[PDB]
Amino acid sequence: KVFGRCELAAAMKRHGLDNYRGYSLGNWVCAAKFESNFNTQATNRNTDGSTDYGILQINSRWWCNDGRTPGSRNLCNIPCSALLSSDITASVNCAKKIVSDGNGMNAWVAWRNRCKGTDVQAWIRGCRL
């Protein structure tokens, strides 16, 4: 499923992500734009055999089990295919675990490179929330 900006903003807000561990909603919508371009099915097959899965491109070496990643851990206790569904819940629940462990939203390179330090409010422009 591909989400539009406001549709995803709304769904993320429904899932309690606004101000989660100090990160306002615009951060999460900015991170999903540059990680996956709002696509729940995006996958990026990496160098040491891990793959990033879903709207928020969560990595299989530490967070989910896909059965083929070299020294993998399954900290969110899920199959990586749960992160590829049209409904965002397994991705937001694993993302809340990531931000609570590894240094806030720095875990997402696209947030850290493209969103960090900009005015993220813009990403909720025009969405009545």
Domains and CATH numbers, the chain: 1-129 (1.10.530.10)
Resolution to one decimal, Å = 1.7
Report which of 113, 91, 109, 62 is spatially closest to residue 3, judged by C-alpha positions. 91
Distance CA 4, CA 17 (A): 17
Q: What was the elucidation method?
A: X-ray
Query: In the 3-class helix/strand/coil scheme, how is 24-73 assigned residue by residue?
Result: CHHHHHHHHHHHHCCECCCEEECCCCCEEECCCCEECCCCCECCCCCCCC
What residue type is assigned to position 22 of the chain?
Answer: G
52 is catalytic: yes
Numbered residues of the known binding site for substrate: 101
> Among residues 7, 48, 52, 119, which one is catalytic?
52
Q: How many residues does the structure list for the chain?
A: 129
35 is catalytic: yes
